[PDB]
Amino acid sequence: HPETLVKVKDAEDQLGARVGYIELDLNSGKILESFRPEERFPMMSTFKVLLCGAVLSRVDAGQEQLGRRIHYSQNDLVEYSPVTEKHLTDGMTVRELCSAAITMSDNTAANLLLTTIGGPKELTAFLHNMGDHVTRLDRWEPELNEAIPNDERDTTTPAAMATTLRKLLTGELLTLASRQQLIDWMEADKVAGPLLRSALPAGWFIADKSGAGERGSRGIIAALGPDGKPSRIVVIYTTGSQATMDERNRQIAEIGASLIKHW
Numbered sequence: 001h002p003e004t005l006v007k008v009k010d011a012e013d014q015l016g017a018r019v020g021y022i023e024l025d026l027n028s029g030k031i032l033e034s035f036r037p038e039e040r041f042p043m044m045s046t047f048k049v050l051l052c053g054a055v056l057s058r059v060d061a062g063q064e065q066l067g068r069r070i071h072y073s074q075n076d077l078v079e080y081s082p083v084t085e086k087h088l089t090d091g092m093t094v095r096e097l098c099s100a101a102i103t104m105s106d107n108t109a110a111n112l113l114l115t116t117i118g119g120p121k122e123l124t125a126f127l128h129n130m131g132d133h134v135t136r137l138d139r140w141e142p143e144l145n146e147a148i149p150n151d152e153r154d155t156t157t158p159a160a161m162a163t164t165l166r167k168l169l170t171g172e173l174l175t176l177a178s179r180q181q182l183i184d185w186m187e188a189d190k191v192a193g194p195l196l197r198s199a200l201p202a203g204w205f206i207a208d209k210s211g212a213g214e215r216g217s218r219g220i221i222a223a224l225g226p227d228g229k230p231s232r233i234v235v236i237y238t239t240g241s242q243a244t245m246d247e248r249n250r251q252i253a254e255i256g257a258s259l260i261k262h263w
Contacts, residue, residue: 001262044211145213216241
């Protein structure tokens with residue numbers, strides 16, 4: 001809806017920064033609204049959904065098992081590792097690692113999972129092979145959040161991310177079980193409270209993944225809809241703003257409010 005694009009424009013003005021936006025019909029794959037669809041933004045932690053998509057593909061092919069246990073040490077632990085810091089002694093299963101990476105945005109969990117697939121280069125190769133030749137992951141946590149202006153490392157476009165997410169959640173790539181698991185992890189998101197969720201009416205479904213990084217970078221990818229079922233994908237990114245986390249949160253929630261209003 002036009003007024004949602006006005007809200008996005010409002011956000012650019014008030015943040016003093018670029019905002020990218022896509023609203024995509026989940027079933028038909030038709031783009032309903034867009035803003036800067038072909039411009040690059042740092043993915044930040046939103047890449048963690050793509051990461052577990054690649055892990056689940058390996059699980060489907062038998063190259064990975066969700067119950068496989070990984071042990072690691074104190075020195076593997078990077079900044080913001082709320083789950084992995086608690087399991088030095090017992091290790092974590094692959095399933096637990098993806099849960100930590102998606103629902104809590106655990107950074108060490110993401111690095112361990114990256115190691116299982118062969119690193120950022122192999123995540124990018126995974127994306128390439130499912131038809132996304134735009135999105136690229138280049139670094140590990142936490143350096144991938146650096147968001148140097150015009151640096152194309154660790155970036156996506158709103159259009160590429162939105163269509164890739166649709167393929168992962170509802171396309172032919174993954175088994176039904178793996179699709180359900182990926183969206184289940186996203187529904188269980190615990191660190192995106194002040195974002196789209198804050199605009200979400202009672203009874204609506206949402207499955208999402210937030211991101212935050214340096215230089216004002218903030219974003220969210222989501223499947224959401226009324227009557228307890230997702231029916232649209234929403235992607236929102238911004239980078240470059242000097243604004244507080246709180247203002248950036250409120251802008252994204254406000255775009256969300258408009259999206260919902262004009263559903």
